[PDB]
Design goal:
Chain A: Its EC number is 2.7.1.40, 2.7.11.1, 2.7.10.2. Four copies of one chain form a homotetramer. Chain A has 17 helices and 21 strands. Chain A is α/β, with parallel strands linked by helices. In chain A, helix 2 packs across helix 3, helix 7 runs parallel beside helix 9 and helix 10 packs across helix 12. The first copy, chain A, is elongated, with a radius of gyration of 24 Å. Chains in contact: A-B, A-C, B-D, C-D. Bound molecules: phenylalanine (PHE) (4 copies). One phenylalanine binds next to strand 19 of chain D.
Chain lengths: 504, 413, 508, 498
């Protein structure tokens, strides 16, 4: 009845029998590359596998994808318990990176550091000289500008502008390693959004059959469509997730969202570009707008960073990941925790626990009450059935909303209204089953059975397939009642048929 | 905005904060912030309550600090319009290494010292049950009966028996770091949200402590994860935010106070006051106490006739406290001649307490107008409202009233 | 959003664009028995034909019923524009009547105000009544009345108060004076009269209704729940599908309304003779209470008597009658019954036309959204698919501003449960059962249509044909057009257990 | 819905919140009868200036005030009684029957004449009326209605000074009966010479309200306001809507008028009889939205002129007027010339008290809140809002001009509004507004302001406990100013009943 009293009833000693509705995306790297480890990671709750193309070769990532798909299809023998695992391609984009250390160096406060463009010191960086790959650096920043190196752990101040160099004073010190990312906040970064390397990697994704692309450093709508053109006709089905990681992306969010399939909120990279006391507002703004438009939103960076070396996360991390879920994030991404961490499996397992516990603190009723009031007054048959199905899901105490779909668009439209009941998406399309994980609350199942001659025989077969899996995952028992969404005729165009069927 | 989602959607990071910072700021005063000149700058920056950790330091050491807090505070007493009341808190040591005594021999000595030093509130450490709260109440006695007891939840048993503690206490402190080692980390946020929620329902203050801005001890800027951690705590419905080592021994104490003001004022824009009040009105037991009736009616009017503030003429503070439990968007200007209640009012979120130093007029009605006019001048100076605006004034009916039942819709002169 | 706003922007110069959703029942007597008149009455609005079995023999009514069906089936050649006409049998019921005054049945004796009068059960006085002595055919008068009770003679014009009780005699005091004729109705306010639910004639009349294949029975003078089941048992297994509408005619019927409603299919509020029993300042509350309780239950309620009585002699009704009928519609009544206006009056056609005008004007004053909003919260929590799909269809009817709700029903039940929640859009009940199409008129909002097409062997095609049939009628009646969107409720597979399927379909 | 919870056996547990206006004629003129009428529930006494001399009405007013001030000994039980003046206006009236009523039969021929020799010789064949310009404004086929529309005539032949009509709807024709000409450009002045003399007499008699007959446009109300002028600036003008143009140009009339009377009987003749119920609901609704009193008149308990008990159709009609949101309901011939005048007022009190049980006050308030676009208004909303929240027994309002209490009644609370006033005229005028229980304070003004309020609140608290509005332990809401000689009624205090 009230959100306030809903928070008052939260018991920590009471185990949560609420399904972990958010999708877990894991960055696959050197520590989780093997087939055997991936098998366990899928069981723990991995839904999407991210491949970071900032490092490694095409051949390296090709073997990674093979290991991901081998571990996934090891459960294909049992379609009742099978889980679709999506493949993701994270682009490098316009990055500025440091060189190599001669022979990690320790930087002291107030010390003079010379950032050069001379390729003689490319692989000879020390406590005095530094090299980076952005040739137009002295043309974009003036005297007094702040240069951030390695997650913004090392901060510099330009004392004097040079020709092919920059004289900087160290404000924040630390262990400066090789090949580290460089940030220039408030600079006219004139690097292309889609570099020549990005064009190579994006086309490789088309050939490796990726389900989604995480496009880095997206600043405007024209950037998104440049990624759309590179994917072309053969990659028209691949979902483009635009990563917001600077101030311009926050400023021009409306045009980015309207051009993109989804948005990734990189809170670490954003925290360096914009002031720290404003990042929480940007996260809550961007997630809320993605909820309004009904497009997937992923939270990345600074999630469980402590789990790279320790088998347990801290308090602040557990609270921060949970608050992202409460904001309305569809997915939450693990970076170095699963990529190169000492405890990759535990990083996935803890994420399942943190997200599942956050589910109890979500007041679903209000979300649907509010989303239907902003839902445009339309006569769209699918949209009217989507509202009606979620409306009926709350009133019938429904175990699930079974949605029969080919494209996924009808199942995605149900997810927009955020129901308590999990949305079982029945499909024969393997890609749309993988891509369904981007959305919160959608439980995708892949029907392997052939298309039945009669239309009614096919629907009842797919409904009974979803009924079996829903009972297997404990969503609903025998005496429960669920909602089924289908079309009316073969080649319908609209998923407008809603029926309230009791579970056999 | 008609919608909480719409309220989140319209948020703009480039837009300067329009709403004043309703959250309370509590600072641990130690070696770094002990000096009068530093304390003066913290009061200007936004410090409301001064904390003294009795885990270390002698009674001589703390009495010198309390004197310095009051030396810094009373320098602003020259301007009654701009003067800010600063509360003095006493954080008791608490038994450390369970049926260990609720109040140790040192704690009893420290508590009685607080009564002598005229402290405003006690942060009772390691509270596990209701008998622990009553034992602290016993030590304070009749001389410290107006001192507020804020129970510190630090263990698993503190969470399990929270309801008997809250009813007995005057307020609650969520020690998040201390709770983090006692219970699993993936559960602390739920415990934090439950406690803050139940405190909001009860009408009793709630404070968030430990692991707020720990990085500001050595660095002049916080990590963005801390900025989120502080903001969400405020967004849960917390009244006050407590800084520990950032102000006590850290290298950047003044910067920590200013950063606390910036985060909490930014988190203020993400708060939906329409939902908070409507839910608190529904869940509240329907009257029939004339004050609770007038408190609800005033908060509803603050939205309906779009008021700039709620002026409350209170003596003990309880009236402004019962208006604060319903969470209005407009600030609650609590006018009082009592210094202690002006100091203790910072515990409640949304209250701007002002100390009236004017003499009591022989005619009651004239004294009310004088107290109201003072609140108008303060409100205009703080930029809460202007001449054209309308405010809601709350008073008692006659000299020596048991109720604050009188309500006035009054245009600003 | 405001109900007051609706009243503020009402215009009398503006004709009603809102459709008349409340069913019209007409009594067929001497003035309207002719097929030609019955043809014109169906055109004007008539939905249900009422036969008053209080007068006229079985032979007389059988011709009228035949005449009603002759006039109805003349429009059968066009399935799109055909309107089913229901047959209603109004029973005579139990009635207390006096004897004859001093011989002849035309003789009339004056009665003093404040004088003593005696009532006897001795049958020797049955044709020997005067100023002092009166006779009643009710043999059990003494055991239902007590000292100080009221006895009303002839439509409540003569009131009496009993002073002393006996074994089979009553001495009474006269309060209301006037002339007293022979064999006239007697009323007992607040008294639990134990006359049998069905009279010996009613047993004959109810069996006759089954033989004439009636749709509904207006069971007269219902006082308790067992009275309804008495009529039910008489109609038997053969007349199980005949709807029983209980008539509330006295104080006991109002007091024991809940048990009557839970035992009946519908309710009739006969305000006229109910006004004789209970005081005038309480009749309107009884009317508003009973109609409200019927809406919550989801069972039809009809208002009767004192409707357009002036139209028996005049071509136009009075203001008070126009407002009285409109208020009854606004209370939430499903049907509105005409008595002497259509039966024995001078202007039976002008009466049916006027009823269409008032009931259509009242529809504008009704705020449809609120009716559903208050009925949604009061609906007890149930996981029954048939009721759960019904709430979703009415939810969408306001959401996507639908032209109509198309319901494929066989027994009527599916359409009834949708009508319970009162949507603005009409409920087109597509049925193959002729009786279902006729009985549906009892519910407000239901526009029944009779599909005469053969059952298509492919189930999906049989639905599409019935849906396209409703789509054809909907355009013809002007409920919706090409651009509009409608809601369709169906089963799932041939011989479905529930009507669980709902569709949002555009109009071709 | 609380409609299902209604019970006819249980006595009404709520006060009769609507006002009762009774017409005073020969059958209720006496002081003895008037006393019992005030006891039975009469609030406003209407004087119909269509009949009787100025000498006749002055004695009637005297008798009303003599009967009212007999209860003045007990200020707790005292009820203020208002005096109303109903103007004649543009009326058309028949002549006098020679030799008594004549029988008019359907199909017969009746001649309408303007001959002054025939003005007192009216019969079955010939009939005289006072409208001298009837020939110029009426046409062949036009309908002429006589005696409140009971008798109808259709014009068959026109003449220079005569009209030949056919009797369409027959009946019994009395003397000096009212004549209607629907759809005719009646060039009779809105304010006649008699109307000027009657209004000036009203000011002389110190009347509280004027019932303005046959108002078609806004300038008709302004013309009445001019005749009252400076001396009668505080007399409330209630415009009667009796014709079609009054409905068409309603928004301009309401703006110029203090209140509205819905003459349903006259309206049912001038417009189609079926569309009247919509007009009644529209005019009441617009009056409730504007915060001005609306009265329902004519065809209330008409059968009570002859019978001691009304029909159920009359009871259901009178109740529905209240249920539409009417402030007052007026009796005409039932109390003026009827055989049972006292019983008519008692039925009125019963019906309106029973109809009160079927009103959902929370619905009305939540709807009137949103349509509202000032400290006095803001405090008026808050008082009604709180009255539901703390189940208040009453809303006590200290008022001088009455406006403060009128602002409260506008939002239609469930709790009775007790208006404490020292102004006698505002105490009498307060009956126009629904849910306002006016009470006249005759106590001297206390030197200390807070003392004057606490004494007045105690006076209202004694009245409320006597009327059964509340008791010890209940909660009331008090509305006052802040100081003596103040602007706004912005003070709201919640006070428990001792
Ligand atoms: N789609 C995710 C999360 C999820 C689980 C269960 C129900 C709904 C969503 C998965 O299948 O793992
Ligand atoms: N109570 C705190 C915060 C606050 C400011 C302004 C209004 C309300 C609350 C203070 O006065 O400093
Ligand atoms: N069922 C009635 C009334 C009605 C009309 C239109 C829509 C709904 C109901 C008829 O067919 O005439
Ligand atoms: N105004 C009328 C009716 C009324 C009675 C009681 C309460 C409110 C109104 C009177 O005082 O007599």
């Amino acid at each position: 009845d009230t959100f306030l009293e809903h928070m008052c009833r939260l018991d920590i000693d009471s185990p949560p029998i609420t399904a972990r509705n958010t999708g877990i995306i894991c960055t696959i790297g050197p520590a989780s590359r093997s087939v055997e480890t991936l098998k366990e990671m899928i069981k723990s709750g991995m839904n999407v596998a991210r491949l970071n193309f900032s490092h490694g070769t095409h051949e390296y990532h090709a073997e990674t994808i093979k290991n991901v798909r081998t571990a996934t299809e090891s459960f294909a023998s049992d379609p009742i318990l099978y889980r679709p695992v999506a493949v993701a391609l994270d682009t490098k984009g316009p990055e500025i990176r440091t060189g190599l250390i001669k022979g990690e160096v320790e930087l002291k406060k107030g010390a003079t550091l010379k950032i050069t463009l001379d390729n003689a010191y490319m692989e000879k960086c020390d406590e005095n000289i530094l090299w980076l790959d952005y040739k137009n650096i002295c043309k974009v920043v003036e005297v007094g500008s702040k240069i951030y190196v390695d997650d913004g752990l090392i901060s510099l101040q330009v004392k004097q502008k040079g020709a092919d160099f920059l004289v900087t004073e160290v404000e924040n010190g630390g262990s400066l390693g090789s090949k580290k990312g460089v940030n220039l906040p408030g600079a006219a970064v004139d690097l292309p959004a889609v570099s020549e390397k990005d064009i190579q990697d994006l086309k490789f994704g088309v050939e490796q059959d990726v389900d989604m692309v995480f496009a880095s450093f997206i600043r405007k709508a024209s950037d998104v469509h440049e990624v759309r053109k590179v994917l072309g006709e053969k990659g028209k089905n691949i979902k483009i997730i635009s990563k917001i990681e600077n101030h311009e992306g926050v400023r021009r969010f409306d045009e980015i969202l309207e051009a993109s399939d989804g948005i990734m909120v990189a809170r670490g990279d954003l925290g360096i570009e914009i002031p720290a006391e404003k990042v929480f507002l940007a996260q809550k703004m961007m997630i809320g707008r993605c909820n309004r438009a009904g497009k997937p939103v992923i939270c990345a960076t600074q999630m469980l960073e402590s789990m790279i070396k320790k088998p347990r996360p801290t308090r602040a991390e557990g609270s921060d990941v949970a608050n992202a879920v409460l904001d309305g994030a569809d997915c939450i991404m693990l970076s170095g925790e699963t990529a190169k961490g000492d405890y990759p499996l535990e990083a996935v397992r803890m994420q399942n626990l943190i997200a599942r516990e956050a589910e109890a603190a979500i007041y679903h009723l209000q979300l649907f009450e509010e989303l239907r009031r902003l839902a445009p007054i339309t006569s769209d048959p699918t949209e009217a059935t989507a509202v009606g199905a979620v409306e009926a899901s709350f009133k019938c105490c429904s175990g699930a909303i079974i949605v029969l779909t080919k494209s996924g668009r009808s199942a995605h439209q149900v997810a927009r209204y955020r129901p308590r009941a999990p949305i079982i998406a029945v499909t024969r399309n393997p890609q749309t089953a993988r891509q369904a994980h981007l959305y919160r609350g959608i439980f995708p199942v892949l029907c392997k059975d052939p298309v039945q001659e009669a239309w009614a025989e096919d629907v009842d077969l797919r409904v009974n397939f979803a009924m079996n899996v829903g009972k297997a995952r404990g969503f609903f028992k025998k005496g429960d009642v669920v909602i089924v969404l289908t079309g009316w005729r073969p080649g319908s165009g609209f998923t407008n048929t809603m029926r309230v069927v009791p579970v056999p």
